[PDB]
Design a protein around this ligand. Structure first.
Ligand SMILES: N[C@@H]1CCN2c3c(F)cc4c(=O)c(C(=O)O)cn(C5CC5)c4c3COC[C@H]12
Ligand SMILES: N[C@@H]1CCN2c3c(F)cc4c(=O)c(C(=O)O)cn(C5CC5)c4c3COC[C@H]12
Ligand SMILES: [Mg+2]
Ligand SMILES: [Mg+2]
Ligand SMILES: [Mg+2]
Ligand SMILES: [Mg+2]
Ligand SMILES: [Mg+2]
Ligand SMILES: [Mg+2]
Lengths: 482, 208, 482, 210
DNA sequence: GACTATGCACG
DNA sequence: CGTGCAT
DNA sequence: AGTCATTCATG
DNA sequence: CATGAAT
């Protein structure tokens, strides 16, 4: 009716349970696909439901609830909130979810409720899922025990670096900034040819982060330190033009701001300086952003030191800030502080297991069909005899022992033949089959090569990484300086 | 509540009365901030015929609305001391959208009569289809489809192009043609008395 | 760029627009299946999804989102709140939804949030959907114009009366109380045999409402009035025992209360009588209800006129209320006030439409096959020549054409024949086929009779109604008096 | 917020601290209104090892726990003036359930040491399974000879809860006793304290990620 | 349908 | 102080 | 995750 | 004042 427990021997068990879980399965990304599980499920789920870039939008509530009843047993709102972020193009460098309707803003105001918005996977996310139908990735049982889910996605590009993460667990947290997709691929590709690549060389391809929010990044030194140890402190500064106004008045105009910064607060906190007269000479602050462009006018008074105002704002507001790398992720089930190399290596590693897994799957398919086709080619030259033989059999099974015994077909061939629809006897054309049998032998040859030669496989992996780069490559947004 | 225009200007400034916090949100985004303010109507506007003038003034959407227009209510109402050249009611192209337009319109007829008779009260016609079409007759001619179920599924750049752009927008103006035929019409649909309404509905609504 | 309309003309198109919709398509039940469109959508969706009484419960959020994306384009909350109500056994006489978890109480504390609860259709609910898959009810397009949805359900029992409806719209409202399944079915069966049946006689079978909260319904005359004109004011009074307590004191003990009455608010409003002492003699009010019993003890003082108190509470609380019939429903797309008679009449007419529709369907199926089977029985008489004709044909199309022209097979059979799997050639048994040919001819004769004989048809309808009664019938809860 | 027991009585009355309003409400229905009180813990509970005693006295859960147990808090805490003879923590059997147990316990330890030291702080073990009921994956596999996998408390109807966890003569129940007083201050401080390094290291030393 | 407070790690 | 999955 | 207000008809 | 689908 009652058992007793130590306070020590309890907090131990309890907190250890929550510690483990919130680390492996909540707050930190897998080092290969760059996803926290809630994100992976959203993606796997929408994909299963055919909710993709090429097809109509689904009401969000439908996507969410299906997630929540098939894979993720948590708040509907948490799931929605996550889904919304993956769609905000000022937090993700390369957005994974497209969403019709109010999905927030840089001004921080809240997105429309899950009942109003429609959504679907971005074309890019498709590549995160590529080949999943092909037994290329380890599946686990879902909380129900009713359906298998993937533990990691195939990742046809290296999501972790491209879209970043962040990041608060127990005993560990993570902040990984987003990166220009093309650069990361350039790095990965070099490292594929050059396993032992030093950070310095990789940095000729992958020079630093590329924020979707744009702006100026400063600190080659700390960027190296970060790419080496997983931690570093870089500086992000706002992009700023200076316009002359009539009457000898000048105007500081802001066109880009620092990652993770709320435009609306920033604007107040600046007007806050003006109001408090903290720095001499500010006439008026004005957010002049509109549906197609960010723009903050900080018009100053006549005879005002414009370099004094700008410098003060950079220091005492968020017009310029510190970004801190804290690159933590989950490798062999453990949290792991990691730099550029443990990342790209793990990615390449994984891209390997996948291409290998995929290539067996396809080989085996092609083998089985080649087998059937080989049988169908013989059948044709003995069509009549075969028909006659079947006609003479007592039933289905007997027709097969007869096809075997009399013509040495295999079970699998016999089955194929015996289940052919009558009208097929009008398709008696060997040369089309002989063309497929050839198509097939070549396919099997190519795949076998992939499977038995590490170099051949890595070149596949480069051909593909490049294809992705050609398809999704876009210009840098953040400039660098040191 | 209110997201205000940047610069105060009676001659240009427009007041958008949006049905919904959600759409209120796409409006803040798609608008032109220099002269377009946004006031969301969160929930169904009170009926200003049925309710008591006591509970009418203790109403949040009625307060912030009399106060955001700055002319006051009743006959203590100065149309010269307004705050907007135009006032724009923007709702979903749905039934409840219709209902809301219907309640807002009785409030202005009842408690700001000058504004409607001065032609300052409008109604935005959002698109029904997507080129863009407003009628099922304007679409089939455009076939030579995304079906908007409400403002909430429209993106800011789209909302502007189709219904907020003072140069691209279709815009209905409310007028009082026969003052006394408008008091009956209003008092029957929105009044406290049920039976007259039923008959009206029976006589004019074709159930087919 | 800008066009004007009259106030008189703008309130017209707006209020007429809304009115029509909120009457035909929101607040009021179809007179035949008893459902408002939201409830119907809820049941049809869950059913399409196999979320049925015989299968694991689903997370409510999955169901709700699926309703919202396929059929009901409105609040996820509204939809849920509806779903939850169809599962509260104290609002519905016969609940259509089974929900695991906090779904509320007679104390009217709110149900657990959509994210916690699970649900499925009740067994009886299935009977509302019986035969939907046989083209027995008109379908329309959803809002999407992507999926059809039923406009009314097949209603294998008469839900409108059994479960009730309420009921606020524009220009109209509706209050129909629930009734005993068995009593309603008994009435409908009588009317089937006796179309012109008078109320007085129908009331021998269906004497009054049967609230699921039971209690006492007083006013045989107004029940009549209501069954006649669809309006009528009856009294509902709580079931009360009186216990003596060791002290010369007495206790009033409530065990059943009035439909739609909140137990927690009642108990409070009664204690308010005690606390204000509007009436002398109340010592304590105790809600003593547990998970398997309702029980409110009103402990009186010594020398305290218990008749006087009980009467006061019946008057000045909801211990006793009036219930007003306002039976409005949708007959022919129109709001219509109706009494017992057009209700049973419309039901019966509906069940006829269904049974006819259903029998045409099953018949068309039986025929399409019996036709095939005829062809096959022939093919065997001429197997060798049919194989030769296919062998000699150029392709599926040409073969079908040859079977038609050379042997008078029809398309449908020529299709069947040509798409037979080779192993079928093994068989020559014409008997088994013949047995099926018989079973099929019999089935068609049976179904044709139904369609062609109004009485055969009505007999079937009675038979079915009775099965439903034998299966789901349960005793009265509310007693009657005048 | 609080649902009181119908009869005051420190000798029998139980206080149920339930994870969340949904389940708090299921418990409101399944309880025995004569001696069982329910107090919903709406949300994650404040870490009283990290936060400043100021922000602590200003937190609604802690205030309405201290002021319904009727014994004040801290060193001005009379054990004799309590209201309940058994305080029952009842949380979903999930990780975040486990997390709450962690936080509530650190609080009693920290600001009501006399209440646990006297064995008045219990923990309800809800059922993990239903095919009857089973608590351990081992207690399960034995039933399949003689499965609804409870994902939380909010998925159970009231007559279910009462029978398996709330009914005093049918419930399994943990009693939190303190064995090594000085070896708890350390176990608690490592895990719930402000300093982060120790906790990271304790996780590295005890949690097997396998 | 927007609002409100917590945990967790990190400058 | 704010970040983002959780309660 | 509970909470707040309004429509609509009726007694 | 409470009802139940809607904003
Ligand atoms: N005591 C706290 C103040 C209010 N509050 C919230 C909340 F603010 C947000 C949320 C949410 O945003 C939220 C979500 O689904 O995203 C869920 N909850 C509830 C489970 C706690 C919230 C709660 C819980 O209620 C109590 C606490
Ligand atoms: N101005 C009103 C006060 C608070 N309130 C509610 C509300 F109380 C409930 C609800 C709901 O229960 C509710 C639901 O989906 O069930 C929806 N809304 C919003 C669409 C109006 C509600 C709103 C709207 O916000 C403003 C109004
Ligand atoms: Mg939240
Ligand atoms: Mg700064
Ligand atoms: Mg709408
Ligand atoms: Mg609501
Ligand atoms: Mg009364
Ligand atoms: Mg939980």
């Amino acid at each position: 009716n009652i058992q007793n427990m130590s306070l020590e021997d309890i907090m131990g068990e309890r907190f250890g349970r929550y510690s483990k879980y919130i680390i492996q399965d909540r707050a930190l990304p897998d080092i290969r696909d760059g996803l926290k599980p809630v994100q992976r499920r959203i993606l796997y789920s929408m994909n299963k439901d055919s909710n993709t870039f090429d097809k109509s939008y689904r009401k969000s509530a439908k996507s969410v609830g299906n997630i929540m009843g098939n894979f993720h047993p948590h708040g509907d709102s948490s799931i929605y909130d996550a889904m919304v972020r993956m769609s905000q193009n000022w937090k993700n460098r390369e957005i994974l979810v497209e969403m019709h309707g109010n999905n927030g803003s840089m001004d921080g105001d809240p997105p429309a409720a899950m009942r109003y918005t429609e959504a679907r996977l971005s074309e890019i996310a498709g590549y995160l899922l590529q080949d999943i139908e092909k037994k290329t990735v380890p599946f686990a049982w879902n909380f129900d025990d009713t359906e298998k889910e993937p533990t990691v996605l195939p990742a046809a590009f290296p999501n972790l670096l491209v879209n970043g993460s962040t990041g608060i667990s127990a005993g560990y947290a993570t902040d990984i900034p987003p990166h220009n997709l093309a650069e990361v691929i350039d790095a990965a590709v070099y490292m594929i040819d050059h396993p032992t690549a030093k950070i310095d060389k990789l940095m000729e391809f992958l020079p630093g982060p590329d924020f979707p929010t744009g702006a100026i990044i400063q600190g080659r030194d700390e960027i190296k330190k970060a790419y080496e140890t997983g931690k570093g402190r870089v500086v992000v500064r706002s992009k700023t033009e200076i316009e002359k106004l009539k009457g000898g008045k000048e105007q500081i105009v802001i066109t880009e701001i620092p990652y993770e910064i709320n435009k609306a607060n920033l604007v107040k906190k600046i007007d806050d300086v003006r109001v408090n007269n903290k720095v001499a000479g500010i006439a008026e602050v004005r957010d002049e952003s509109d549906r197609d462009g960010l723009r903050i006018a900080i018009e100053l008074k006549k005879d005002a030191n414009t370099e004094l105002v700008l410098n003060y704002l950079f220091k005492y507001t968020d017009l310029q800030i510190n970004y801190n790398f804290n690159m933590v992720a989950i490798d062999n089930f453990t949290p792991r502080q990691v730099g550029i190399v443990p990342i790209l290596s793990s990615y390449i590693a994984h891209r390997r297991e996948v291409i290998l897994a995929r290539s067996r799957f396809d080989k085996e398919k092609a083998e089985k069909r080649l087998h059937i086709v080989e049988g169908l080619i013989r059948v044709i030259s003995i069509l009549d005899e075969v028909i006659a033989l079947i006609r003479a059999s007592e039933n289905k099974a007997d027709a097969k022992e007869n096809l075997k015994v009399s013509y040495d077909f295999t079970e699998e061939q016999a089955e194929a033949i015996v289940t052919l629809q009558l009208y097929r006897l009008t398709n008696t054309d060997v040369v089309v089959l002989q063309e497929e049998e050839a198509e097939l032998r070549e396919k099997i040859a190519m795949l076998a090569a992939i499977i038995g030669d590490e170099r051949t496989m890595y070149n596949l992996m480069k051909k593909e990484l490049r294809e992705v780069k050609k398809k999704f490559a876009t210009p840098r947004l953040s400039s660098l300086e040191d | 509540k209110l997201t205000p225009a940047q610069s105060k200007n009676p001659a240009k400034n427009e007041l958008y009365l949006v049905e919904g916090d959600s759409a209120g949100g796409s409006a803040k985004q798609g608008r032109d901030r220099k002269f377009q303010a946004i006031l969301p109507l969160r929930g169904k506007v009170i009926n200003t015929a049925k309710a008591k003038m006591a509970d009418i003034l203790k109403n949040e959407e009625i307060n912030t609305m009399i106060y955001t227009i700055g002319a006051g209510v009743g006959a203590d109402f100065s149309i010269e001391d307004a705050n907007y050249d135009k006032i724009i009611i923007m709702t979903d192209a749905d039934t409840d959208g219709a209902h809301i337009q219907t309640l807002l319109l009785t409030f202005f007829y009842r408690y700001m009569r000058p504004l409607v008779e001065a032609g300052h009260v409008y109604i935005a016609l959002p698109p029904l289809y997507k080129a863009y079409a407003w009628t099922d007759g304007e679409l089939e001619e455009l076939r030579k489809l995304q079906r908007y179920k409400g403002l909430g599924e429209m993106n800011a750049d789209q909302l502007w192009e189709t219904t907020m752009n003072p140069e691209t927008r279709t815009l209905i103006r409310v007028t009082i043609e026969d003052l006394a035929r408008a008091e009956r019409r209003v008092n029957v649909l929105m009044g406290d008395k049920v039976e007259p309404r039923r008959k009206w509905i029976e006589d004019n609504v074709k159930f087919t």
